[PDB]
Amino acid sequence: MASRILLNNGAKMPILGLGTWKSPPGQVTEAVKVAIDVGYRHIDCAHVYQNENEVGVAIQEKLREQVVKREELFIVSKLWCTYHEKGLVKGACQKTLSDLKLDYLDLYLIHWPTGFKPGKEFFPLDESGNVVPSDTNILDTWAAMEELVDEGLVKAIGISNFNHLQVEMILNKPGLKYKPAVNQIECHPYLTQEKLIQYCQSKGIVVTAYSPLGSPDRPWAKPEDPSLLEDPRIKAIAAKHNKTTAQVLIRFPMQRNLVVIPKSVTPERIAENFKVFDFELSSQDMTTLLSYNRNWRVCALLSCTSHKDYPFHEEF
Ligand SMILES: NC(=O)c1ccc[n+]([C@@H]2O[C@H](COP(=O)([O-])OP(=O)(O)OC[C@H]3O[C@@H](n4cnc5c(N)ncnc54)[C@H](OP(=O)(O)O)[C@@H]3O)[C@@H](O)[C@H]2O)c1
Ligand SMILES: O=C(O)COc1cc(Cl)ccc1C(=O)NCc1c(F)cc(Br)cc1F
């Protein structure tokens, strides 16, 4: 299987990338350096992760060392919810560019479909704990994203955590100039996403799977939640293939024509997670993994559930 997938902007995107949410700032520079050394060419970032400066130090060092050329890297970031307004989008993108020490992003995503009140706080709340919306909508935010392409700041634009109706709304936007290249969504054997993936793929939108290992370090994990990495059914498939459970979990989305972005700051795991291009899951393995769906989400957030554009009320 090829290492990159063709996007609807004409560029190629590496199907494996390194995630950076929760990567501590004192560890992520080395993590990204190791990743690039062992073959990663795609890094998934976001302003809200609060570590783009440190990710950028690694990228810049590897460019300066001439380990890789800029054209060989595929750097992704995301516009946070408090920057959906017309007059804030460019500055938000530019702050990310400055922190990452780049002159362009390969892909810039609307992080969530919901706009929040601008200000210092990433999650502005009312006194009862509900997020405070902005009156921005996904269509006007999309137009602002299109401007970034036309200014040379980003090579591609896309969306993240958009449900099927929201994707449809973008595709049906009056005067749409650029289609979204990517929809980045949670996807793993407990949240298999057949409906939304099929829809996006049918429209030429590439899907990126986040939390492919079930995000065991998510800060809201409960001791009782289901655990992909410990599921004996998945362990059995891994054992049959002489691979680790994590390697199976990463290979799974790859064979569905998805991009996948496992996170690690552990050098041995960063390397392990990249060693997924030399084995194949059978069709039976794939269908078996799909059968584990239980509609379980890592990423959901009670404080945001009443926002008009919160994505997870719809079935898909
Ligand atoms: N667009 C969005 O809204 C959104 C939401 C969630 C995630 N994302 C992106 O997707 C990335 C991945 O998702 P995620 O961070 O939620 O979780 P994940 O990649 O599913 O899991 C990361 C966890 O798995 C551990 N791990 C990594 N490789 C392992 C291996 N080979 N064996 C055992 N454990 C391993 C990591 O530990 P160590 O790091 O300690 O090794 C970390 O605790 C994020 O970092 C972010 O870039 C985007
Ligand atoms: O959103 C992500 O990329 C990962 O999750 C988070 C990362 C940070 Cl730095 C802070 C918060 C979260 C989180 O709570 N994510 C879930 C979440 C939203 F952040 C925002 C909305 Br809208 C819905 C939702 F489920």
Query: Which helix (DSSP H) or strand (DSSP E) does residue 294 occupy?
Result: none
What's domain 1-316's architecture?
Answer: Alpha-Beta Barrel (3.20)
The alpha carbon of 65 and the centre of ligand 2 are apart by a number of angstroms equal to 34
Neighbours of 209 (CB within 10 A): 25
Say whether 190 is catalytic: no
Protein residue with least CA distance to atom 48, ligand 1 = 210
Selecting among 49, 108, 190, 199, the annotated active-site residue is 49
Closest by CA position to 17, among listed 209, 279, 228, 219 = 209
Does residue 162 line the site of ligand 2, with CB under 6 A? no
Q: Are the C-beta atoms of 183 and 189 separated by less than 8 Å?
A: no
Specify the residue with its C-alpha closest to ligand 2, atom 11: 48
- Alpha helices (H) in the chain, listed in sequence order: 25-38, 52-64, 86-100, 138-150, 164-171, 194-202, 232-240, 245-254, 267-274, 283-290
Report helix, strand or coil for 223. coil
Q: What long-range pairs does 59-68 form, CB within 8 A, spacing at least 24?
A: 59/32, 59/100, 59/101, 59/102, 60/101, 61/29, 61/33, 62/32, 62/33, 62/36, 62/37, 67/36, 67/37, 68/36, 68/41
Amino acid at residue number 130: N
* Strand 12-14, strand 4-6: pairing: antiparallel
Characterize the bridge pairing of strands 18-19 and 42-44: parallel
CA dist 210 to 19, 126, 160, 185, Å? Answer: 8, 29, 10, 6
For 1, 45, 201, 262, 310, the CA distances from 215, given in Å and listed in that order, are: 26, 16, 25, 9, 21
CA distance 241 to 46: 34
SS3 of 315, please?
coil
Cα–Cα distance measured from residue 62 to residue 60, given in angstroms and rounded to the nearest whole number: 5
Eight-class DSSP state of 52: H
Distance 8 CA to ligand 2 centre (A): 27
C-alpha to C-alpha distance for 130 and 5, rounded to whole angstroms: 39
> Ligand 2 centre and the CA of 129: distance in Å?
15
Among the bound ligands, name the one nearest to the CA of residue 133.
2
Residue 289 φ/ψ, nearest 5 degrees: -60, -40
How many CA atoms are closer than 13 Å to the CA of 76, on its beta-carbon side? Answer: 30
Residue of 69, 164, 167, 168 whose CA lies nearest to 109: 167
| Contact between residue 258 and residue 210 where contact means Cβ atoms under 8 Å apart | no
Ligand 1, pocket-test mutation among 264, 272, 275, 276, most atoms within 8 A of CB: 264
What is the identity of the amino acid at 23? S
Alpha-carbon distance 254 to 117, whole Å?
37
- Cα within 13 Å of Cα(21), Cβ side: 18
Report residue 186: phi and psi, to 5°. -65, 135
Domain edges within the chain: 1-316
Pocket test for ligand 1, best of 40, 163, 215 (most atoms within 8 A of CB): 215
How many angstroms does the Cα of residue 242 sit away from the middle of ligand 2? 35
- SS3 of 129-195: CCECECCCCHHHHHHHHHHHHHCCCECCEEEECCCHHHHHHHHCCCCCCCCCCEEEEECECCECCHH
Q: First and final CA of the chain: distance in angstroms?
A: 29
Experimental approach taken: X-ray
Q: What residues form DSSP beta bridges with 12? A: 6
Question: Tokens standing for 147?
Answer: 């401007």
Resolution for this model in angstroms, one decimal place? 0.8
Return the bridge partners of 13, or none: 5
**How many angstroms separate the CA atoms of 214 and 207, rounded?**
17
